[PDB]
């Protein structure tokens, strides 16, 4: 998991990360970015493609836009590769405050049944929440993105 | 290189491209997919990204669409992987008709200065050519694609 990696691979996750979120969040694009950790995510997840890609902003960006066919689901990030695209987690049950979304029930989901985390971009504000464990944190200013980011990761 | 994999990985990647093809050629979306073969690439190109990722169809799509960050330039086909996307050739000096742009004379360059064997798409008029030892050969009807890029990989 991440805690495992070396210091440059988690520092280059993270920069990758914080770029392609800067730009879905600022152009309003929907997006889901799953980070794997100590649980498994393969047997949680249905359908979508397995691209196994160094982990790069531009590709993550290229992802979700709406004339891409992998826009549609959640992202699947192992170590530092973009492992699966457009693949479905089982929602939560739990219902949100209006302002949330299905990608927000998704991600709830899949935090509720693993130890991953979870970066959502809201396709009709460019609000950015980071998911684990069925709790939701706001990254309101992206500036500390990074920070925040690497915190979850390492708890 | 492509000779030296199994005949069913040469299937699955061929299909891949086909579908990709199909889709790019259709919509007008212009791309530029290289297939290293015996003489390695990697002095040859400038900038793009590594991504090494698998071929698919759908990621193909993603990485030449419209507001992709990587649909400027080419990709490079190593093997069974993705090696690098929207990475630029030293274009081929020579002139060519007004039907062709700067994709065509960037495939021309590269396919003159190594055995590669490059895919490209026309923006303009979606017309499909294969560029191989600085000779274009066009592929006006796309259900041939899989059997004349098959053969060009292979002789
Ligand atoms: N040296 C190169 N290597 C790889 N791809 C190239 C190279 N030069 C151009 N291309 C591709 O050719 C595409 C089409 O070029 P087009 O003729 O439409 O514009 P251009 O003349 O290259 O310059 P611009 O669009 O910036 O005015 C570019 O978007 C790029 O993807
Ligand atoms: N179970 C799920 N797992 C992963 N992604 C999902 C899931 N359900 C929906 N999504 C994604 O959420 C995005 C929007 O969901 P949608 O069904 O349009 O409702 P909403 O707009 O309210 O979120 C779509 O891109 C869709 O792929």
Redesign the pocket.
Known sequence: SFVDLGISTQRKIVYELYFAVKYLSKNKV?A?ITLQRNILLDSL?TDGVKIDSLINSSLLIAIFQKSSPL????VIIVDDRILYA??????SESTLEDRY???????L??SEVSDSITVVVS??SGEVVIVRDANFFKVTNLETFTEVLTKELNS
Chains 1, 2 share one sequence.
């Open positions: 929907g889901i997840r826009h549609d689901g959640a457009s693949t479905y987690f089982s929602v979304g299905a990608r927000h029930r998704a991600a989901g899949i396709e009709q």
